[PDB]
Amino acid sequence: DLQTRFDRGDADVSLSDVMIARNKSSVAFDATVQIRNKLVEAYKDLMNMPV
Amino acid sequence: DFNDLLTKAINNVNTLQKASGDLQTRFDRGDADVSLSDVMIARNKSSVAFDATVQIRNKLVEAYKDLMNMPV
Amino acid sequence: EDYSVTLQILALMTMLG
Amino acid sequence: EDYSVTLQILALMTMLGFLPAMVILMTSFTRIVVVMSILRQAMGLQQTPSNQVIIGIALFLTFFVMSPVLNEINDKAVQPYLNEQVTAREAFDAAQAPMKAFMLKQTRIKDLE
Amino acid sequence: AISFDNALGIHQHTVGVRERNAEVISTNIAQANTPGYKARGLDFAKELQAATSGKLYRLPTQPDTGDGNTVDLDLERNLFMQNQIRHQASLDFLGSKFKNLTKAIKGE
Amino acid sequence: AISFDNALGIHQHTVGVRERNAEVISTNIAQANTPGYKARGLDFAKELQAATSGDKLYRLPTQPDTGDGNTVDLDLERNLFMQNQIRHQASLDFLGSKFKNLTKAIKGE
Amino acid sequence: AISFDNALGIHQHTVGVRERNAEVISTNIAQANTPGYKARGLDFAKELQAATDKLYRLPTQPDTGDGNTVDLDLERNLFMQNQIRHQASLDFLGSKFKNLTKAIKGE
Amino acid sequence: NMVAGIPGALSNQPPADASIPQDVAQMKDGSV
Amino acid sequence: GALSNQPPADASIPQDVAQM
Amino acid sequence: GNMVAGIPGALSNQPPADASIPQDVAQMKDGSV
Amino acid sequence: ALSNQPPADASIPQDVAQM
Amino acid sequence: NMVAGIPGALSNQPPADASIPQDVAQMKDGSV
Amino acid sequence: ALSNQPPADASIPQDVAQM
Amino acid sequence: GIPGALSNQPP
Amino acid sequence: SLFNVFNVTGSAMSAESVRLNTTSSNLANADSVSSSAKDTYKARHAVFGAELSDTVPVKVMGIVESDKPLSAEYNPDHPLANEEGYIYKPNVNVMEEMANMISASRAYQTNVQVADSSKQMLLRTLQMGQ
Amino acid sequence: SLFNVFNVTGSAMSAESVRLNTTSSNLANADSVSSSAKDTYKARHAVFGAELSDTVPVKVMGIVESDKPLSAEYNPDHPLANEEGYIYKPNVNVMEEMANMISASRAYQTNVQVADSSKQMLLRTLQMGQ
């Protein structure tokens, strides 16, 4: 939302607010990608063991 | 004593990071008795210590994975 | 005393491994 | 002439690379895995104990039996090195001596000959 | 706990405040020739505290020439220069917080 | 032997000392016209030794003051400020390489 | 082979000579007004031989009772030429390591 | 509430000169 | 500088200080 | 509060026989007040 | 020449006797 | 050895014009 | 050009016969 | 303040 | 702390500006016999201070009039003349005002260079380590 | 070592500034019969020196007065006149002082050029390799 408001020329949105917010989501999305990757690797390791 | 050795190294890394963040907060607040050189020195020490912590952890985890995946 | 945010993430990401 | 700090960091970061080799060759991990591997084959179950569980128990066993040598390394090489009592080469030699004593204790003469 | 308010510290708010201070100094320089304009300042300590947990007048060093304008242009240049330097430092500190945060969650 | 004091050498202290010298030189340039002000100087060898193992001197005038008591030779002060600025940058390059050399040894790249 | 002496060539020594030459020219300009001072010139080939001296300059015009043989027109030109050539030597010697590092790292 | 006036030479003089129209001189007081 | 909470007054340039 | 004071520039750099600086101001040159 | 004792003020008297 | 003398106008004169003191002119040769 | 010995000074005599 | 200091207010 | 330099050089910028405006008031009132405050104008001068006891800022502690006597002129028919026929004029000396104008302007500009050079040392400090 | 150059140029500027002040005191005392010390003012000249034996700084080793006789003036009614009515004045020569003023200024400015040029060389060396 902050990216769209700044891009369309709204005068009440500052670039610092956009950059802090977009970096904030980038770290969160990278974190949820890494957590998902680790969980899938754990599942693959457990299921690929002889029983 | 090996448990003490590992915790002491981590406490050293954690102590450096706290000092780095402490100076950055004081400098950013506008404190007069803070020099940029000390802030840059402090945060460079924290960066080197944390880089060592990550690489050592990666080496130990890689060593662990090699042993566990060994066919007995 | 308390571990920094960067160290807390490193410990948590370690346990997932 | 003690090595520079950069070389010393590069020297002991290489030890981490060779860490798996030390466990499988210079430690007790080899015998414990083999005995439990033959023990598993002795019973009817083919792979019930599983390789990972066998390695896990072996890692705990090799840690408990190598504690005196690890403690000797710390109390002869690591502590003087951290306290600036000896140089890098002396610390390296002081760490190797307890390791060599352990291998020589559990070896055979004919194999040495 | 792991949160951005504890990971970023005050650097998330400090960057924004110095941008406001840039505007306040900028509007002082532009209104230097406008008679009746009183130079206004921004108290960084008070503004930062308000942002974390949520326009004073500058006194003239010399009497105005008669227009009624109390903007000292050489002071504004000096204050703008310092504010721009510390703003870059604030960006450096805040930006490094994310990069060190990404390094931890990624492991390399 | 791996420690920041051993790896960073004296360059972790020289930067702070040359920053102090710049402040001492700058206040001499600013106070050049103030009468009764004696030009101040900072000894580098003493200050570096004090920093290494944990009070500015007076600069003697080459010519008498013209009746104001101020002994600031603004011609000389500019020369010292220029030299200190160059040596300050050189210490930054030395200290900066100390951290970079440690990082490339740790990361192996 | 493969040694720093051969990798750097003679560019490792030229930078030093251009610094010594700049010092001498700076001395000549400063001592231009002091009577009795004789202008000092540095022979480039001598420091070339020293790598692999501090002579006197004969005046083109007579003195005026000072005995000072410094021509400020000559010194400024010789200082300008030395400074330009000094930067080129830094560029030559600087690129020796840049190529050397690229060969080792392959990137 | 705009503050207004002639910028520059006319304003930076004593009022005894009286080179500014009286209406414009009022605007600098802070009322329009 | 010395930030105050009330706007500073305009300087007065009188030809005679009595008529002020 | 151990300061040094005086009129900067041309007034002070005249010899003291000129008597241009007020005596009260001229005596704040030795560190007094 | 960094000394430890502040330099004394120069004196420009009319007569060196009354100095 | 050390060489010295008065610079500028006085030295840039013929020796007949005895502006330079006699002992200072001696220094202009060599000293130690 | 250069030389290995200092150049001589300049003579400005009021009478060349006495040098 | 300065004993001979001048005031910025009307006499 | 190179930001302390900005407090020192910047203070000199204001201090040298006061002495320049002081000079302008002396140049413009060197021939003014009357005044709005009923006292004849006298050559005003700023007072610089240094609270020496690291960085010592320069602060103007007040403007002080010159101690020279007023220049008397024999104008017996002037409305403001006294019984002896003399009128009094400000004791402003042209030569010292010119020196103040030259000294203050040069002192103002030499603090810009220090403030500009100290700015560069801070920017390179941020660049350290990378 | 280009930092040694800064010492040579810095010492040169100090030497030329001493000569300028000596020239200033000569022009101000070209007509002074009396003095604080009871001896007629004689034209002063700072003595430069070189410790040649790389970088040879120029040093001022003292002020030496000109040995020319004091210009006597026939002023019999002057209070300081001798038995024959002659008063003695400084031997300052106007033409030679103007040349010193021109020479001291030009020599001062050319050492600034060398110092500035030498400063660029040191900064360029910092960029070597990096």
XYZ file of N, CA and C in Angstrom, chain O residues 48-115:
204
model
N 35.072 39.327 22.187
C 35.191 37.887 22.025
C 35.649 37.243 23.329
N 35.243 35.997 23.525
C 35.586 35.274 24.736
C 35.972 33.844 24.432
N 36.784 33.275 25.321
C 37.199 31.879 25.214
C 37.227 31.289 26.616
N 36.303 30.371 26.893
C 36.173 29.765 28.218
C 37.127 28.576 28.329
N 38.417 28.887 28.228
C 39.433 27.848 28.283
C 39.547 27.283 29.693
N 39.668 25.964 29.780
C 39.734 25.285 31.066
C 40.416 23.927 30.938
N 39.724 20.452 24.965
C 39.258 19.938 23.684
C 38.844 21.068 22.745
N 37.553 21.384 22.729
C 36.997 22.406 21.853
C 36.498 23.577 22.686
N 36.958 24.778 22.349
C 36.572 25.989 23.068
C 35.823 26.916 22.118
N 34.497 26.990 22.204
C 33.749 27.884 21.313
C 34.043 29.346 21.606
N 33.893 30.173 20.576
C 34.050 31.618 20.692
C 32.663 32.242 20.736
N 32.386 33.004 21.789
C 31.088 33.632 21.969
C 31.255 35.123 22.212
N 30.404 35.912 21.569
C 30.353 37.347 21.819
C 29.586 37.591 23.110
N 30.221 38.282 24.053
C 29.638 38.540 25.360
C 29.072 39.947 25.489
N 29.026 40.707 24.400
C 28.466 42.047 24.430
C 29.268 43.045 23.619
N 28.590 44.094 23.166
C 29.204 45.155 22.377
C 29.573 46.303 23.304
N 30.780 46.837 23.128
C 31.336 47.857 24.007
C 31.797 49.038 23.165
N 31.506 50.247 23.636
C 31.905 51.460 22.937
C 33.385 51.755 23.153
N 33.977 52.445 22.182
C 35.389 52.796 22.254
C 35.638 53.833 23.343
N 36.860 53.825 23.876
C 37.247 54.734 24.946
C 37.820 56.052 24.438
N 37.986 56.208 23.129
C 38.535 57.446 22.597
C 37.572 58.601 22.862
N 38.079 59.800 23.135
C 37.187 60.952 23.297
C 36.514 61.316 21.985
N 35.334 61.917 22.098
C 34.603 62.354 20.919
C 35.371 63.451 20.191
N 35.261 63.450 18.866
C 35.951 64.433 18.038
C 35.160 65.734 18.057
N 35.758 66.786 18.607
C 35.094 68.075 18.702
C 35.338 68.905 17.448
N 34.304 69.633 17.033
C 34.379 70.494 15.862
C 33.801 71.857 16.198
N 34.491 72.907 15.759
C 34.069 74.280 16.026
C 33.012 74.664 15.002
N 31.745 74.565 15.410
C 30.596 74.949 14.590
C 29.724 75.877 15.426
N 30.083 77.160 15.530
C 29.386 78.051 16.471
C 27.938 78.334 16.114
N 27.543 78.199 14.850
C 26.185 78.509 14.428
C 25.302 77.276 14.296
N 25.818 76.093 14.607
C 24.995 74.895 14.561
C 23.956 74.938 15.679
N 22.756 74.400 15.450
C 21.748 74.384 16.522
C 22.179 73.614 17.758
N 23.027 72.596 17.610
C 23.433 71.743 18.719
C 24.747 72.182 19.355
N 25.270 73.343 18.975
C 26.533 73.813 19.519
C 26.378 74.208 20.985
N 27.495 74.166 21.705
C 27.530 74.519 23.112
C 27.932 75.984 23.264
N 28.197 76.398 24.505
C 28.572 77.786 24.761
C 29.884 78.143 24.074
N 30.860 77.234 24.103
C 32.142 77.487 23.459
C 32.077 77.360 21.943
N 30.958 76.899 21.391
C 30.800 76.813 19.954
C 31.186 75.494 19.330
N 31.329 74.435 20.120
C 31.783 73.146 19.625
C 30.632 72.151 19.552
N 30.646 71.338 18.498
C 29.772 70.180 18.382
C 30.647 68.939 18.429
N 30.063 67.832 18.871
C 30.798 66.593 19.080
C 30.333 65.532 18.093
N 31.286 64.781 17.560
C 31.051 63.769 16.547
C 31.638 62.444 17.003
N 31.137 61.327 16.474
C 31.630 60.016 16.912
C 33.122 59.850 16.666
N 33.759 59.094 17.554
C 35.197 58.836 17.496
C 35.519 57.612 16.644
N 35.040 57.602 15.407
C 35.259 56.483 14.500
C 36.480 56.778 13.642
N 37.435 55.853 13.635
C 38.662 55.998 12.865
C 38.574 55.141 11.608
N 38.812 55.765 10.454
C 38.625 55.082 9.175
C 39.594 53.914 9.032
N 40.863 54.123 9.396
C 41.883 53.114 9.131
C 41.603 51.815 9.879
N 41.189 51.908 11.143
C 40.928 50.695 11.910
C 39.661 49.990 11.441
N 38.686 50.737 10.919
C 37.493 50.104 10.363
C 37.831 49.281 9.128
N 38.727 49.791 8.281
C 39.153 49.036 7.107
C 39.870 47.754 7.506
N 40.730 47.825 8.526
C 41.408 46.627 9.006
C 40.416 45.628 9.586
N 39.408 46.116 10.314
C 38.373 45.230 10.835
C 37.583 44.579 9.706
N 37.264 45.344 8.658
C 36.562 44.775 7.513
C 37.394 43.698 6.830
N 38.696 43.931 6.679
C 39.575 42.941 6.069
C 39.770 41.743 6.991
N 39.989 41.991 8.285
C 40.249 40.895 9.212
C 39.008 40.036 9.427
N 37.845 40.668 9.602
C 36.626 39.907 9.866
C 36.214 39.076 8.659
N 36.328 39.641 7.454
C 35.952 38.895 6.259
C 36.867 37.696 6.044
N 38.175 37.875 6.240
C 39.102 36.762 6.069
C 38.926 35.721 7.167
N 38.656 36.165 8.396
C 38.414 35.223 9.484
C 37.124 34.446 9.264
N 36.115 35.090 8.677
C 34.870 34.394 8.369
C 35.099 33.280 7.354
N 35.917 33.542 6.333
C 36.104 32.578 5.256
C 37.022 31.432 5.663
N 37.987 31.690 6.549
C 38.906 30.628 6.946
C 38.234 29.618 7.866
N 37.093 29.979 8.460
C 36.341 29.013 9.250
C 35.424 28.169 8.375
N 35.075 28.666 7.187
C 34.320 27.854 6.237
C 35.157 26.667 5.777
N 36.443 26.902 5.504
C 37.315 25.826 5.048
C 37.464 24.741 6.106
N 37.616 25.136 7.371
C 37.722 24.150 8.441
C 36.413 23.391 8.600
N 35.284 24.099 8.534
C 33.988 23.434 8.625
C 33.738 22.543 7.413
